[PDB]
Amino acid sequence: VKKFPEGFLWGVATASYQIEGSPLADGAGMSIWHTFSHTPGNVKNGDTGDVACDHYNRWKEDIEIIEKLGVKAYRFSISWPRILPEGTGRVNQKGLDFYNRIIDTLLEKGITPFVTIYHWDLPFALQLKGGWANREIADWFAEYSRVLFENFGDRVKNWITLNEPWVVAIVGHLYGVHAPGMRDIYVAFRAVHNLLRAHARAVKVFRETVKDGKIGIVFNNGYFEPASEKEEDIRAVRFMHQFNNYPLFLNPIYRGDYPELVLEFAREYLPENYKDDMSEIQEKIDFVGLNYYSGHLVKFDPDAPAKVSFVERDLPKTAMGWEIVPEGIYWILKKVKEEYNPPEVYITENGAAFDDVVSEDGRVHDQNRIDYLKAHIGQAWKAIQEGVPLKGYFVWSLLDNFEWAEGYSKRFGIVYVDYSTQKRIVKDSGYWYSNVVKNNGLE
Protein backbone atom coordinates (compact mmCIF):
# COMPACT_ATOMS: atom_id res chain seq x y z
CA VAL A 1 0.00 0.00 0.00
CA LYS A 2 1.06 3.61 -0.91
CA LYS A 3 -1.88 5.92 -0.29
CA PHE A 4 -1.59 9.57 -1.49
CA PRO A 5 -3.01 12.64 0.31
CA GLU A 6 -6.77 13.21 0.44
CA GLY A 7 -7.73 15.45 -2.51
CA PHE A 8 -4.53 14.50 -4.45
CA LEU A 9 -5.15 15.25 -8.11
CA TRP A 10 -4.83 12.35 -10.55
CA GLY A 11 -4.59 13.65 -14.09
CA VAL A 12 -4.16 12.94 -17.75
CA ALA A 13 -2.54 15.43 -20.12
CA THR A 14 -2.88 16.46 -23.83
CA ALA A 15 -1.91 19.35 -26.17
CA SER A 16 -3.95 21.04 -28.83
CA TYR A 17 -1.77 20.50 -31.97
CA GLN A 18 -1.00 16.95 -30.95
CA ILE A 19 -4.61 15.81 -30.83
CA GLU A 20 -7.12 18.21 -32.35
CA GLY A 21 -6.66 18.14 -36.12
CA SER A 22 -8.61 20.57 -38.25
CA PRO A 23 -5.98 23.28 -37.73
CA LEU A 24 -7.77 25.73 -40.06
CA ALA A 25 -11.45 24.92 -39.20
CA ASP A 26 -13.76 27.73 -38.11
CA GLY A 27 -11.59 30.75 -38.93
CA ALA A 28 -8.41 29.56 -37.12
CA GLY A 29 -5.11 31.15 -38.21
CA MET A 30 -2.13 29.01 -39.21
CA SER A 31 0.34 28.07 -36.48
CA ILE A 32 4.08 27.64 -36.76
CA TRP A 33 3.55 23.87 -36.40
CA HIS A 34 1.16 23.83 -39.40
CA THR A 35 3.82 25.57 -41.53
CA PHE A 36 6.74 23.62 -40.02
CA SER A 37 5.16 20.18 -40.47
CA HIS A 38 4.00 21.07 -44.05
CA THR A 39 7.60 21.87 -44.88
CA PRO A 40 9.28 18.84 -46.51
CA GLY A 41 11.93 17.23 -44.33
CA ASN A 42 10.98 18.57 -40.90
CA VAL A 43 8.86 15.68 -39.57
CA LYS A 44 9.11 11.84 -39.81
CA ASN A 45 7.08 10.41 -42.79
CA GLY A 46 5.87 13.86 -43.72
CA ASP A 47 3.36 13.66 -40.79
CA THR A 48 1.35 16.71 -39.92
CA GLY A 49 -1.26 17.80 -37.47
CA ASP A 50 -3.97 18.00 -40.15
CA VAL A 51 -5.99 15.17 -38.70
CA ALA A 52 -4.24 13.79 -35.65
CA CYS A 53 -6.69 12.09 -33.20
CA ASP A 54 -9.48 14.19 -34.69
CA HIS A 55 -10.31 15.51 -31.16
CA TYR A 56 -11.74 18.66 -32.65
CA ASN A 57 -14.83 16.54 -33.55
CA ARG A 58 -14.45 13.65 -30.99
CA TRP A 59 -13.86 15.85 -27.92
CA LYS A 60 -17.18 14.76 -26.11
CA GLU A 61 -16.23 11.10 -26.47
CA ASP A 62 -12.66 11.68 -25.28
CA ILE A 63 -13.89 13.40 -22.16
CA GLU A 64 -16.41 10.58 -21.71
CA ILE A 65 -13.31 8.30 -21.60
CA ILE A 66 -11.80 10.57 -18.89
CA GLU A 67 -15.09 10.38 -16.91
CA LYS A 68 -15.37 6.59 -17.49
CA LEU A 69 -11.84 6.12 -16.09
CA GLY A 70 -12.73 8.36 -13.07
CA VAL A 71 -9.67 10.51 -13.73
CA LYS A 72 -10.04 13.67 -11.66
CA ALA A 73 -8.06 16.30 -13.65
CA TYR A 74 -7.56 17.01 -17.38
CA ARG A 75 -4.57 19.04 -18.49
CA PHE A 76 -5.18 20.34 -22.05
CA SER A 77 -3.80 23.27 -24.10
CA ILE A 78 -5.41 26.09 -26.02
CA SER A 79 -4.44 26.87 -29.60
CA TRP A 80 -3.56 30.58 -29.64
CA PRO A 81 -4.36 30.96 -33.39
CA ARG A 82 -7.92 29.46 -32.91
CA ILE A 83 -8.58 32.32 -30.44
CA LEU A 84 -6.75 35.20 -32.15
CA PRO A 85 -6.02 34.16 -35.79
CA GLU A 86 -3.47 37.01 -36.31
CA GLY A 87 -2.02 36.62 -32.78
CA THR A 88 -3.34 39.98 -31.55
CA GLY A 89 -6.40 42.03 -32.45
CA ARG A 90 -9.38 39.94 -33.63
CA VAL A 91 -10.96 37.34 -31.32
CA ASN A 92 -12.49 34.30 -33.16
CA GLN A 93 -15.74 33.45 -31.24
CA LYS A 94 -15.86 29.96 -32.71
CA GLY A 95 -12.44 29.19 -31.20
CA LEU A 96 -13.68 30.31 -27.85
CA ASP A 97 -16.88 28.25 -28.25
CA PHE A 98 -14.83 25.04 -28.97
CA TYR A 99 -12.95 25.40 -25.62
CA ASN A 100 -16.11 26.60 -23.76
CA ARG A 101 -17.76 23.30 -24.62
CA ILE A 102 -14.79 21.30 -23.34
CA ILE A 103 -14.67 23.42 -20.14
CA ASP A 104 -18.45 23.09 -19.41
CA THR A 105 -18.49 19.35 -20.04
CA LEU A 106 -15.52 18.80 -17.75
CA LEU A 107 -17.22 20.81 -15.02
CA GLU A 108 -20.56 18.93 -15.51
CA LYS A 109 -18.64 15.74 -14.93
CA GLY A 110 -16.72 17.15 -11.96
CA ILE A 111 -13.37 16.87 -13.79
CA THR A 112 -10.79 19.60 -12.91
CA PRO A 113 -9.44 21.54 -15.93
CA PHE A 114 -5.72 22.58 -15.95
CA VAL A 115 -5.29 24.91 -18.98
CA THR A 116 -1.92 25.24 -20.72
CA ILE A 117 -2.01 28.72 -22.43
CA TYR A 118 1.03 27.93 -24.65
CA HIS A 119 2.00 24.49 -25.75
CA TRP A 120 4.07 25.42 -28.77
CA ASP A 121 1.47 26.33 -31.50
CA LEU A 122 2.38 29.99 -31.92
CA PRO A 123 0.35 31.93 -34.50
CA PHE A 124 2.26 32.01 -37.76
CA ALA A 125 1.36 35.70 -38.02
CA LEU A 126 3.50 36.48 -35.00
CA GLN A 127 6.35 34.29 -36.25
CA LEU A 128 6.49 36.65 -39.26
CA LYS A 129 7.23 39.49 -36.75
CA GLY A 130 9.93 37.54 -35.00
CA GLY A 131 7.98 35.22 -32.66
CA TRP A 132 9.78 34.59 -29.34
CA ALA A 133 12.77 36.56 -30.70
CA ASN A 134 10.79 39.87 -30.61
CA ARG A 135 10.55 41.63 -27.21
CA GLU A 136 7.03 42.66 -28.16
CA ILE A 137 5.80 39.07 -27.60
CA ALA A 138 5.52 39.85 -23.84
CA ASP A 139 2.67 42.22 -24.82
CA TRP A 140 1.17 39.83 -27.43
CA PHE A 141 1.18 36.96 -24.96
CA ALA A 142 -0.27 39.10 -22.15
CA GLU A 143 -3.13 40.23 -24.42
CA TYR A 144 -3.86 36.59 -25.39
CA SER A 145 -3.67 35.43 -21.74
CA ARG A 146 -6.05 38.23 -20.82
CA VAL A 147 -8.58 37.08 -23.46
CA LEU A 148 -8.48 33.58 -21.95
CA PHE A 149 -8.80 34.81 -18.35
CA GLU A 150 -11.75 37.07 -19.26
CA ASN A 151 -13.61 34.31 -21.08
CA PHE A 152 -12.80 31.23 -19.05
CA GLY A 153 -11.52 32.31 -15.61
CA ASP A 154 -15.00 32.22 -14.10
CA ARG A 155 -14.76 28.39 -14.59
CA VAL A 156 -11.12 27.50 -15.02
CA LYS A 157 -9.06 28.23 -11.91
CA ASN A 158 -5.86 26.22 -12.58
CA TRP A 159 -3.68 27.83 -15.31
CA ILE A 160 -0.21 27.16 -16.85
CA THR A 161 1.54 29.97 -18.79
CA LEU A 162 4.15 28.03 -20.82
CA ASN A 163 4.85 24.38 -21.50
CA GLU A 164 8.62 23.59 -21.47
CA PRO A 165 10.11 26.95 -22.46
CA TRP A 166 13.62 25.41 -22.74
CA VAL A 167 12.41 23.13 -25.56
CA VAL A 168 10.56 26.12 -27.17
CA ALA A 169 13.71 28.24 -27.06
CA ILE A 170 16.49 25.76 -27.57
CA VAL A 171 14.93 22.94 -29.65
CA GLY A 172 12.95 25.53 -31.72
CA HIS A 173 15.65 28.15 -32.25
CA LEU A 174 19.10 26.50 -31.62
CA TYR A 175 18.70 22.87 -32.74
CA GLY A 176 16.06 23.73 -35.35
CA VAL A 177 14.32 20.40 -34.72
CA HIS A 178 11.02 21.98 -33.70
CA ALA A 179 9.13 24.97 -35.09
CA PRO A 180 10.03 27.58 -36.07
CA GLY A 181 13.13 25.55 -37.13
CA MET A 182 15.95 28.02 -36.57
CA ARG A 183 19.65 27.55 -35.67
CA ASP A 184 20.92 30.70 -34.08
CA ILE A 185 22.23 30.72 -30.47
CA TYR A 186 21.64 34.45 -29.99
CA VAL A 187 18.01 34.16 -31.10
CA ALA A 188 17.58 31.06 -28.85
CA PHE A 189 18.72 32.97 -25.74
CA ARG A 190 16.67 36.01 -26.63
CA ALA A 191 13.76 33.58 -26.76
CA VAL A 192 14.53 32.15 -23.26
CA HIS A 193 14.43 35.70 -21.91
CA ASN A 194 11.27 36.77 -23.80
CA LEU A 195 9.52 33.60 -22.58
CA LEU A 196 10.25 34.74 -19.02
CA ARG A 197 9.02 38.27 -19.73
CA ALA A 198 5.92 36.94 -21.41
CA HIS A 199 5.27 34.51 -18.57
CA ALA A 200 5.58 37.26 -15.93
CA ARG A 201 3.30 39.65 -17.78
CA ALA A 202 0.58 36.99 -18.10
CA VAL A 203 0.86 36.39 -14.32
CA LYS A 204 0.50 40.14 -13.69
CA VAL A 205 -2.62 40.32 -15.84
CA PHE A 206 -4.01 37.12 -14.18
CA ARG A 207 -3.92 38.82 -10.69
CA GLU A 208 -6.02 41.63 -12.22
CA THR A 209 -8.62 39.46 -13.90
CA VAL A 210 -9.06 36.07 -12.11
CA LYS A 211 -8.87 37.17 -8.47
CA ASP A 212 -9.58 33.52 -7.21
CA GLY A 213 -7.44 31.23 -9.44
CA LYS A 214 -3.96 29.66 -9.37
CA ILE A 215 -1.23 30.08 -12.02
CA GLY A 216 2.02 28.23 -12.70
CA ILE A 217 4.53 27.19 -15.36
CA VAL A 218 5.84 23.79 -16.62
CA PHE A 219 9.48 22.68 -17.07
CA ASN A 220 11.07 19.73 -18.79
CA ASN A 221 13.68 17.94 -16.61
CA GLY A 222 16.16 15.11 -16.94
CA TYR A 223 17.88 13.19 -14.12
CA PHE A 224 21.48 13.68 -15.05
CA GLU A 225 24.19 11.41 -13.49
CA PRO A 226 27.95 11.95 -13.87
CA ALA A 227 29.99 9.39 -15.81
CA SER A 228 32.60 9.12 -13.04
CA GLU A 229 33.78 10.77 -9.75
CA LYS A 230 36.05 12.73 -12.17
CA GLU A 231 37.37 16.16 -12.82
CA GLU A 232 34.44 17.95 -14.39
CA ASP A 233 31.87 15.12 -14.82
CA ILE A 234 30.05 16.35 -11.64
CA ARG A 235 30.23 19.86 -13.18
CA ALA A 236 28.75 18.72 -16.53
CA VAL A 237 25.91 17.44 -14.41
CA ARG A 238 25.71 20.78 -12.59
CA PHE A 239 25.58 22.58 -15.96
CA MET A 240 22.99 20.27 -17.46
CA HIS A 241 20.71 20.62 -14.43
CA GLN A 242 21.00 24.41 -14.53
CA PHE A 243 20.45 24.76 -18.32
CA ASN A 244 18.14 21.87 -19.19
CA ASN A 245 16.06 21.71 -15.91
CA TYR A 246 13.79 24.11 -13.93
CA PRO A 247 16.68 26.47 -12.68
CA LEU A 248 17.18 28.27 -16.02
CA PHE A 249 13.69 29.73 -15.38
CA LEU A 250 13.24 29.45 -11.56
CA ASN A 251 16.54 31.18 -10.77
CA PRO A 252 15.14 34.21 -12.52
CA ILE A 253 11.64 33.77 -11.10
CA TYR A 254 12.80 33.23 -7.49
CA ARG A 255 16.26 34.84 -7.29
CA GLY A 256 16.31 37.39 -10.11
CA ASP A 257 19.11 36.06 -12.30
CA TYR A 258 20.04 33.20 -14.51
CA PRO A 259 21.91 30.29 -12.88
CA GLU A 260 25.74 30.54 -12.53
CA LEU A 261 26.81 27.97 -15.03
CA VAL A 262 24.21 29.32 -17.54
CA LEU A 263 25.77 32.78 -17.51
CA GLU A 264 29.25 31.17 -17.85
CA PHE A 265 28.13 29.51 -21.13
CA ALA A 266 25.66 32.11 -22.47
CA ARG A 267 26.15 35.59 -21.11
CA GLU A 268 27.37 36.61 -24.63
CA TYR A 269 24.03 35.44 -26.21
CA LEU A 270 21.62 37.09 -23.76
CA PRO A 271 20.59 40.63 -24.29
CA GLU A 272 23.00 43.32 -23.01
CA ASN A 273 20.73 44.79 -20.32
CA TYR A 274 18.71 41.65 -19.54
CA LYS A 275 18.84 42.40 -15.79
CA ASP A 276 16.66 45.42 -16.35
CA ASP A 277 13.77 42.91 -16.82
CA MET A 278 14.47 40.69 -13.77
CA SER A 279 12.36 42.42 -11.13
CA GLU A 280 9.21 42.08 -13.31
CA ILE A 281 10.20 38.47 -13.96
CA GLN A 282 9.92 37.74 -10.21
CA GLU A 283 6.10 38.03 -10.38
CA LYS A 284 4.92 35.37 -7.71
CA ILE A 285 3.68 32.02 -9.03
CA ASP A 286 1.32 29.65 -7.22
CA PHE A 287 2.91 26.44 -8.36
CA VAL A 288 5.55 24.75 -10.41
CA GLY A 289 4.76 21.96 -12.94
CA LEU A 290 7.62 19.51 -13.53
CA ASN A 291 7.65 17.11 -16.52
CA TYR A 292 9.93 14.03 -16.27
CA TYR A 293 10.67 11.07 -18.60
CA SER A 294 14.23 9.84 -18.48
CA GLY A 295 17.71 10.19 -17.08
CA HIS A 296 21.07 10.54 -18.69
CA LEU A 297 24.70 9.74 -18.10
CA VAL A 298 26.73 12.88 -18.97
CA LYS A 299 30.45 13.68 -19.17
CA PHE A 300 32.72 16.62 -19.66
CA ASP A 301 33.63 16.46 -23.36
CA PRO A 302 36.05 19.03 -24.84
CA ASP A 303 34.71 18.61 -28.39
CA ALA A 304 30.94 18.96 -27.72
CA PRO A 305 28.89 22.02 -28.84
CA ALA A 306 28.72 23.07 -25.12
CA LYS A 307 31.42 20.95 -23.36
CA VAL A 308 28.91 18.16 -22.53
CA SER A 309 27.99 14.86 -24.19
CA PHE A 310 25.86 11.86 -23.35
CA VAL A 311 27.54 8.49 -22.52
CA GLU A 312 24.96 5.83 -23.54
CA ARG A 313 24.10 3.11 -20.91
CA ASP A 314 22.77 -0.44 -20.83
CA LEU A 315 19.45 0.29 -19.10
CA PRO A 316 15.91 -0.46 -20.24
CA LYS A 317 14.77 2.18 -22.73
CA THR A 318 11.52 3.26 -24.22
CA ALA A 319 10.82 3.31 -27.98
CA MET A 320 12.37 6.82 -27.78
CA GLY A 321 15.71 5.36 -26.79
CA TRP A 322 15.16 7.12 -23.43
CA GLU A 323 16.62 5.46 -20.36
CA ILE A 324 14.06 4.38 -17.75
CA VAL A 325 15.23 5.84 -14.42
CA PRO A 326 12.24 5.96 -12.09
CA GLU A 327 14.19 7.55 -9.24
CA GLY A 328 14.75 10.73 -11.25
CA ILE A 329 11.20 11.79 -10.63
CA TYR A 330 11.97 11.51 -6.85
CA TRP A 331 15.32 13.28 -7.29
CA ILE A 332 13.85 16.24 -9.17
CA LEU A 333 10.97 16.61 -6.70
CA LYS A 334 13.40 16.65 -3.81
CA LYS A 335 15.69 19.09 -5.66
CA VAL A 336 13.00 21.67 -6.50
CA LYS A 337 11.89 21.81 -2.80
CA GLU A 338 15.55 22.06 -1.78
CA GLU A 339 16.56 24.80 -4.27
CA TYR A 340 13.51 27.08 -4.61
CA ASN A 341 10.85 25.68 -2.19
CA PRO A 342 7.73 26.47 -4.23
CA PRO A 343 4.47 26.26 -2.26
CA GLU A 344 2.88 23.61 -4.58
CA VAL A 345 4.41 21.25 -7.15
CA TYR A 346 2.61 19.11 -9.80
CA ILE A 347 4.06 16.33 -11.99
CA THR A 348 2.54 17.81 -15.16
CA GLU A 349 3.77 14.99 -17.48
CA ASN A 350 5.19 11.47 -16.98
CA GLY A 351 4.83 8.62 -19.43
CA ALA A 352 6.47 6.43 -22.02
CA ALA A 353 6.46 5.32 -25.66
CA PHE A 354 6.41 1.60 -26.49
CA ASP A 355 5.47 -0.22 -29.72
CA ASP A 356 1.93 -0.98 -28.83
CA VAL A 357 -0.05 -3.50 -30.87
CA VAL A 358 -3.67 -4.47 -30.67
CA SER A 359 -3.72 -8.18 -29.71
CA GLU A 360 -5.82 -10.92 -31.27
CA ASP A 361 -7.76 -10.65 -27.96
CA GLY A 362 -8.79 -6.94 -28.62
CA ARG A 363 -6.47 -5.42 -25.97
CA VAL A 364 -3.17 -3.65 -25.71
CA HIS A 365 -0.93 -5.44 -23.22
CA ASP A 366 1.37 -2.59 -22.38
CA GLN A 367 2.86 -4.02 -19.31
CA ASN A 368 6.09 -2.19 -20.10
CA ARG A 369 4.02 1.05 -19.54
CA ILE A 370 2.14 -0.17 -16.44
CA ASP A 371 5.56 -0.97 -15.05
CA TYR A 372 6.90 2.43 -16.04
CA LEU A 373 3.96 4.32 -14.61
CA LYS A 374 3.70 2.20 -11.36
CA ALA A 375 7.41 2.67 -10.73
CA HIS A 376 7.39 6.47 -11.22
CA ILE A 377 4.20 6.91 -9.11
CA GLY A 378 5.97 5.04 -6.33
CA GLN A 379 8.93 7.42 -6.50
CA ALA A 380 6.52 10.38 -6.42
CA TRP A 381 4.80 8.89 -3.36
CA LYS A 382 8.18 8.72 -1.65
CA ALA A 383 8.87 12.42 -2.19
CA ILE A 384 5.48 13.23 -0.69
CA GLN A 385 6.57 11.27 2.45
CA GLU A 386 9.65 13.47 2.65
CA GLY A 387 7.58 16.71 2.54
CA VAL A 388 7.59 17.76 -1.14
CA PRO A 389 4.29 19.57 -1.53
CA LEU A 390 3.21 17.43 -4.60
CA LYS A 391 -0.51 18.10 -5.14
CA GLY A 392 -1.09 16.19 -8.43
CA TYR A 393 0.19 13.75 -11.04
CA PHE A 394 -0.55 13.91 -14.83
CA VAL A 395 -0.02 11.01 -17.20
CA TRP A 396 1.25 12.01 -20.68
CA SER A 397 -1.13 11.19 -22.51
CA LEU A 398 -4.83 10.41 -22.60
CA LEU A 399 -4.28 9.52 -26.32
CA ASP A 400 -1.80 8.34 -28.82
CA ASN A 401 -1.00 11.54 -30.74
CA PHE A 402 1.22 13.59 -33.14
CA GLU A 403 4.57 13.43 -31.40
CA TRP A 404 6.18 16.53 -32.96
CA ALA A 405 9.18 15.75 -35.28
CA GLU A 406 8.49 12.02 -34.69
CA GLY A 407 5.03 12.18 -36.17
CA TYR A 408 2.58 9.37 -35.36
CA SER A 409 5.42 6.85 -34.99
CA LYS A 410 5.56 7.23 -31.14
CA ARG A 411 2.66 6.17 -28.93
CA PHE A 412 2.55 7.62 -25.39
CA GLY A 413 -1.21 7.09 -24.80
CA ILE A 414 -3.15 5.14 -22.15
CA VAL A 415 -5.81 4.96 -24.90
CA TYR A 416 -4.64 3.55 -28.24
CA VAL A 417 -5.80 5.36 -31.33
CA ASP A 418 -6.25 3.55 -34.59
CA TYR A 419 -5.63 6.37 -37.05
CA SER A 420 -7.17 4.55 -40.06
CA THR A 421 -10.56 4.53 -38.14
CA GLN A 422 -10.09 6.99 -35.19
CA LYS A 423 -11.24 4.28 -32.84
CA ARG A 424 -10.16 4.50 -29.18
CA ILE A 425 -9.12 1.31 -27.42
CA VAL A 426 -8.37 1.69 -23.72
CA LYS A 427 -5.02 0.11 -23.11
CA ASP A 428 -4.30 -2.04 -20.01
CA SER A 429 -2.25 0.89 -18.63
CA GLY A 430 -5.44 2.92 -18.74
CA TYR A 431 -7.60 0.40 -16.89
CA TRP A 432 -4.85 0.03 -14.50
CA TYR A 433 -4.52 3.80 -13.94
CA SER A 434 -8.23 3.91 -13.31
CA ASN A 435 -7.75 1.62 -10.29
CA VAL A 436 -4.83 3.64 -9.02
CA VAL A 437 -7.17 6.68 -9.06
CA LYS A 438 -10.10 4.71 -7.46
CA ASN A 439 -7.71 3.59 -4.64
CA ASN A 440 -5.91 7.00 -4.53
CA GLY A 441 -2.53 5.18 -4.72
CA LEU A 442 -0.57 1.90 -5.31
CA GLU A 443 -1.04 -1.82 -4.19
Ligand X SMILES: N#[N+]C[C@@H]1[C@@H](O)[C@H](O)[C@@H](O)[C@@H]2O[C@H]12
Question: Could you list the residues that contact Cl ion (CB under 5 A)?
Answer: 134-135
Among positions 235-294, residues that touch ligand X (CB under 6 A) are 291
Cβ-based nearer residue to Cl ion, 197 or 335: 197
Distance of alpha carbon 156 from alpha carbon 99, whole angstroms: 11
42 binds, among ligand X, Cl ion, none (CB under 5 to 8 A by kind): none
Those residues with Cβ within 8 angstroms of residue 93's Cβ, 6 or more apart along the chain or in another chain:
none
Closer residue to ligand X in complex, CB, 163/242: 163
Does the active-site annotation cover 349?
A: yes
Phi, psi of 257 (to 5 degrees): -160, 165
Does the footprint of ligand X cover residue 349 (CB under 6 A)?
yes
CA–CA distance, 311 with 227 (Å, rounded to integer):
7
Instruction: Please state the closest distance from residue 403 (CB atom) to ligand X, in A.
Output: 5
**d(C-alpha 291, C-alpha 173), whole Å:** 21
- Return the one option of ligand X, Cl ion, none that residue 412 interacts with (CB less than 5 to 8 A, by type): ligand X
Task: Kindly tell me which of 222 and 430 has the beta carbon lying closer to ligand X.
Answer: 222
Which of 80, 396, 416, 432 binds ligand X (CB under 6 A)? It is: 396
Which of ligand X, Cl ion, none binds 135 (CB below 5-8 Å, type-dependent)? Cl ion
Beta carbon of residue 432, minimum distance to ligand X (angstroms, whole number): 20
- Whether residue 186 contacts residue 271, with contact meaning beta carbons closer than 8 Å, is answered with no
* Cβ closest to Cl ion, residue 134 vs residue 309: 134
- Taking CB within 5 to 8 Å according to partner kind, which of ligand X, Cl ion, none is near residue 205? none
Cβ–Cβ under 8 Å, residues 388 and 340: no
Exactly one of 20, 283, 349, 403 is catalytic; which is it? 349
Q: Kindly state the smallest distance separating residue 378's Cβ from ligand X, in Å.
A: 21
DSSP conformation letters of 154-210:
TT--EEEEEE-HHIIIIIHHTS-SSTT----HHHHHHHHHHHHHHHHHHHHHHHHH-
DSSP string, 12-36: EE--HHHH---TTGGGPPPBHHHHH
Task: By CB under 6 A, name the one of 9, 12, 15, 332 that touches ligand X.
Answer: 15
Q: Other C-beta atoms within 10 Å of 135: how many?
A: 15
Active site residue 225: no
Q: Is 185 exposed, middle or buried (0-12, 13-18, 19+ CB in 10 A)?
A: middle
C-alpha to C-alpha distance for 120 and 359, rounded to whole angstroms: 35
Specify the residue, 29 or 351, whose C-beta has the smaller distance to ligand X. Answer: 351
Task: Say how far apart CA 301 and CA 298 lie, in whole Å.
Answer: 9
Instruction: Measure the CA angle with vertex 398, ends 396 and 402; round to 5°.
Output: 75
The count of other CB atoms within 10 Å of the CB of residue 243 is: 20
Q: Does 163 bind ligand X (CB under 6 A)?
A: yes
Site mask for ligand X (CB under 6 A), range 123-162, x = bound? ----------------------------------------
Binding site partner of 163, from Cl ion, ligand X, none, Cβ cut-off 5-8 A by kind: ligand X
Nearest approach in angstroms of CB 127 to Cl ion is 14
Residue (280 or 286) nearer to Cl ion, CB: 280
* Residues contributing to the site for ligand X (CB under 6 A): 15, 18, 163-164, 291, 349, 396, 403, 412
Residues designated catalytic:
164, 349
